[PDB]
């Protein structure tokens, strides 16, 4: 039986800057690769994001990573970061969420 090769994390898809009207939902998504599989965490202006009704975080076996914000408010207007790390290294991608006020 063969095993996967050890490779530091890397994103094949990175998160994108978004503009969302206040009150509506917003989602950041990216895809990570690496072996051992990496552990992932999200940051809002470099502060760890904790799972909640407001911040839904998903990470599946295929490496799809996402952060969904259900009702965007002023406090969400920020820089978000998805960081992935395994024993061989780390990878991060960042993007801005601009909350639009009509």
UniProtKB/Swiss-Prot annotation:
One Gene Ontology MF term: myosin light chain kinase activity
Start and end residues of each Ig-like C2-type domain: 9-100
Any GO BP annotation: tonic smooth muscle contraction
Positions of transmembrane segments: none
GO cellular component annotations of the record: cleavage furrow; cytoplasm; lamellipodium; stress fiber
Segment forming the signal sequence: none
Keyword tags: Calmodulin-binding, Immunoglobulin domain
Top-level taxon of the source organism: Eukaryota
Physiological role: Corresponds to the C-terminus of smooth muscle myosin light chain kinase.
Family membership noted in the UniProt record: Belongs to the protein kinase superfamily. CAMK Ser/Thr protein kinase family.
Protein name: Telokin
Highest classification ranks of the organism: Eukaryota, Metazoa, Chordata, Craniata, Vertebrata
Span covered, complete protein: 34 to 135 of 154
